[PDB]
Design a protein around this motif. Structure first.
Motif, PDB file in Angstrom:
ATOM      1  N   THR A  50       2.426   8.260   1.911  1.00 49.63           N
ATOM      2  CA  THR A  50       2.551   8.765   3.266  1.00 49.63           C
ATOM      3  C   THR A  50       3.854   8.223   3.855  1.00 49.63           C
ATOM      4  O   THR A  50       4.150   7.045   3.687  1.00 49.63           O
ATOM      5  N   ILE A  51       4.637   9.072   4.538  1.00 52.89           N
ATOM      6  CA  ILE A  51       5.776   8.602   5.319  1.00 52.89           C
ATOM      7  C   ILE A  51       5.453   8.782   6.799  1.00 52.89           C
ATOM      8  O   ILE A  51       5.148   9.891   7.227  1.00 52.89           O
ATOM      9  N   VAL A  52       5.525   7.684   7.558  1.00 57.29           N
ATOM     10  CA  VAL A  52       5.373   7.700   9.002  1.00 57.29           C
ATOM     11  C   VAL A  52       6.653   7.159   9.640  1.00 57.29           C
ATOM     12  O   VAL A  52       7.062   6.040   9.324  1.00 57.29           O
ATOM     13  N   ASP A  53       7.268   7.962  10.531  1.00 58.91           N
ATOM     14  CA  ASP A  53       8.417   7.533  11.323  1.00 58.91           C
ATOM     15  C   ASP A  53       7.918   6.829  12.581  1.00 58.91           C
ATOM     16  O   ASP A  53       7.144   7.409  13.345  1.00 58.91           O
ATOM     17  N   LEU A  54       8.369   5.581  12.781  1.00 59.21           N
ATOM     18  CA  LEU A  54       7.929   4.772  13.908  1.00 59.21           C
ATOM     19  C   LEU A  54       9.087   4.458  14.859  1.00 59.21           C
ATOM     20  O   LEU A  54       8.960   3.557  15.679  1.00 59.21           O
ATOM     21  N   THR A  55      10.203   5.194  14.755  1.00 61.00           N
ATOM     22  CA  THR A  55      11.380   4.909  15.564  1.00 61.00           C
ATOM     23  C   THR A  55      11.412   5.773  16.828  1.00 61.00           C
ATOM     24  O   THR A  55      12.394   5.726  17.555  1.00 61.00           O
ATOM     25  N   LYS A  56      10.364   6.558  17.105  1.00 64.46           N
ATOM     26  CA  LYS A  56      10.381   7.465  18.244  1.00 64.46           C
ATOM     27  C   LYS A  56       9.223   7.131  19.180  1.00 64.46           C
ATOM     28  O   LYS A  56       8.326   6.374  18.820  1.00 64.46           O
ATOM     29  N   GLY A 107       0.801  -1.206   0.000  1.00 61.24           N
ATOM     30  CA  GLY A 107       0.000   0.000   0.000  1.00 61.24           C
ATOM     31  C   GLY A 107       0.841   1.267   0.000  1.00 61.24           C
ATOM     32  O   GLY A 107       2.063   1.216   0.138  1.00 61.24           O
ATOM     33  N   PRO A 108       0.171   2.427  -0.159  1.00 57.30           N
ATOM     34  CA  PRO A 108       0.843   3.708  -0.333  1.00 57.30           C
ATOM     35  C   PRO A 108       1.404   4.316   0.956  1.00 57.30           C
ATOM     36  O   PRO A 108       1.090   5.458   1.307  1.00 57.30           O
ATOM     37  N   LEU A 109       2.243   3.534   1.653  1.00 62.88           N
ATOM     38  CA  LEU A 109       2.831   3.930   2.923  1.00 62.88           C
ATOM     39  C   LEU A 109       4.310   3.551   2.952  1.00 62.88           C
ATOM     40  O   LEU A 109       4.701   2.433   2.601  1.00 62.88           O
ATOM     41  N   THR A 110       5.120   4.521   3.379  1.00 58.11           N
ATOM     42  CA  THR A 110       6.507   4.303   3.742  1.00 58.11           C
ATOM     43  C   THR A 110       6.615   4.449   5.254  1.00 58.11           C
ATOM     44  O   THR A 110       6.025   5.363   5.829  1.00 58.11           O
ATOM     45  N   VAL A 111       7.372   3.541   5.876  1.00 56.13           N
ATOM     46  CA  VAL A 111       7.614   3.592   7.300  1.00 56.13           C
ATOM     47  C   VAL A 111       9.125   3.670   7.532  1.00 56.13           C
ATOM     48  O   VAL A 111       9.910   3.039   6.807  1.00 56.13           O
ATOM     49  N   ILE A 112       9.502   4.460   8.549  1.00 56.25           N
ATOM     50  CA  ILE A 112      10.879   4.572   9.001  1.00 56.25           C
ATOM     51  C   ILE A 112      11.076   3.600  10.165  1.00 56.25           C
ATOM     52  O   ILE A 112      10.306   3.612  11.128  1.00 56.25           O
ATOM     53  N   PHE A 113      12.119   2.768  10.044  1.00 57.71           N
ATOM     54  CA  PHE A 113      12.515   1.806  11.063  1.00 57.71           C
ATOM     55  C   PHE A 113      14.026   1.882  11.274  1.00 57.71           C
ATOM     56  O   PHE A 113      14.759   2.435  10.447  1.00 57.71           O
ATOM     57  N   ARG A 114      14.472   1.310  12.399  1.00 58.05           N
ATOM     58  CA  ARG A 114      15.892   1.154  12.669  1.00 58.05           C
ATOM     59  C   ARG A 114      16.483   0.208  11.624  1.00 58.05           C
ATOM     60  O   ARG A 114      15.930  -0.864  11.353  1.00 58.05           O
ATOM     61  N   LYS A 115      17.614   0.627  11.043  1.00 60.46           N
ATOM     62  CA  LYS A 115      18.309  -0.160  10.037  1.00 60.46           C
ATOM     63  C   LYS A 115      18.935  -1.389  10.696  1.00 60.46           C
ATOM     64  O   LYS A 115      19.631  -1.271  11.698  1.00 60.46           O
ATOM     65  N   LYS A 116      18.684  -2.570  10.128  1.00 57.35           N
ATOM     66  CA  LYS A 116      19.344  -3.793  10.560  1.00 57.35           C
ATOM     67  C   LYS A 116      20.343  -4.255   9.504  1.00 57.35           C
ATOM     68  O   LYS A 116      21.467  -4.599   9.844  1.00 57.35           O
TER      69      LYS A 116
END
Ligand code: THR
Length: 321
Positions: A183-189, A95-104
């Motif tokens: 949409t970009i949502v940051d989820l790392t905070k 779907g039309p969503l980008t999420v920010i996560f911690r890089k592994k």
């Protein structure tokens, strides 16, 4: 010497996808459709290929590339600490969503992530993109297919204007469904942050994340045509603006097309998704017409029009409050 290969969006010819995948293996950049905007893509594990992307776009090294994946298994390889958000992701991906996560992942070089400890990840809801990624066998790093500062390509005409002769292959699957970036949502905070409004609407995110933060830069606006852009949030000043800025073309809704001489109807207020789907095309049409000023009606800061306004704000030379 650019090849342009048309594919069906639902069941694309896998022979065309294979050819694209071979180019990716060779460290080449290709252009491909998604449900949001066209992407200019390369092997996400290939430093030199991804560097070509920044060059072709003229993009600052500090702006990271979104990494496109086709499965939840791939997510597990490239990101960590998302397990609490799996329910959410499975509701919106593909779907039309980008999420920010911690890089592994160790395989994604610094250039892709702009040396950040986070990675931007998107699972696109477009069979061409999904099948291309799967067939190719690595994630694809891909920002929007356009010269930076120009509107994001929503069809192959736009891609050609920017990139003909600069890339070996463009996959054409028509006009993109949404016309606007994910949409970009940051989820790392501690609290989730909206970094870019898109087809996953603010209102919907606020339902799932009551503590969602919406930074000032999102609300106050990149995506610009080649002629000065006048955005008119106050439509009472519309009369005054037309006379002030004399040599003009207008971009307007269906419901007010009759109120203007030379005007591109971007879409109707009745179906605001039409406005989103066409706004970038409208910008490109308007610049080509023989007028000095592009004048655009503002829209409600709600639903998909929120995202539209975000883009128009970042593009405008003048806003009229
Ligand atoms: C190419 C397309 O997927 C774009 N990067 C977006 O996030 O909308």
């Amino acid at each position: 010497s650019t090849r342009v290969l048309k594919v069906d969006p639902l069941f694309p010819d896998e022979k065309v996808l294979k050819e694209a995948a071979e180019l990716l293996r060779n460290g080449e950049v290709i252009i491909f459709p998604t449900e949001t905007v066209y992407g200019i893509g390369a092997d996400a594990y290939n430093e030199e290929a991804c560097k070509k992307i920044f060059k072709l776009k003229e993009r600052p090294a500090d702006n990271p590339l979104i990494v496109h994946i086709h499965s939840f298994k791939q997510l597990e390889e490239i990101a960590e600490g998302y397990e609490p958000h799996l329910d959410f992701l499975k509701k919106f991906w593909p779907g039309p969503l980008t999420v920010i996560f911690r890089k592994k992942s160790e395989k994604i070089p610094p250039v892709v992530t702009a040396d950040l400890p986070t990675v931007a990840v998107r699972m696109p809801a477009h069979p061409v993109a999904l099948k291309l990624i799967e067939l190719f066998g690595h994630p694809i790093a891909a920002p929007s297919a356009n010269i930076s500062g120009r509107p994001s390509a929503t069809n192959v005409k736009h891609v050609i204007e920017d990139f003909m002769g600069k890339v070996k292959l463009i996959i054409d699957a028509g006009d993109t469904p949404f016309g606007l970036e994910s949409t970009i949502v940051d989820l790392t905070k501690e609290k989730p942050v909206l970094l870019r409004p898109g087809p996953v609407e603010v209102e919907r995110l606020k339902e799932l994340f009551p503590e969602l933060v919406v930074p000032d830069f999102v609300r106050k606006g990149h995506y610009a045509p080649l002629k000065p852009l006048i955005l008119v949030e106050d439509l009472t000043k519309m009369e005054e603006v037309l006379k002030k800025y004399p040599d003009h073309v207008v971009i307007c809704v269906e419901e007010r097309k009759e109120l203007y001489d030379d005007r591109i109807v971007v879409g109707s207020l009745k179906n605001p998704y039409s406005i989103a789907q066409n706004i970038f095309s409208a910008l490109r049409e308007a610049e080509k017409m023989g007028k000095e000023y592009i004048i655009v009606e503002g829209f409600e800061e709600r639903g998909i029009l929120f995202a539209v306004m975000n883009r128009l704000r970042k593009a405008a030379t003048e806003i009229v409050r």
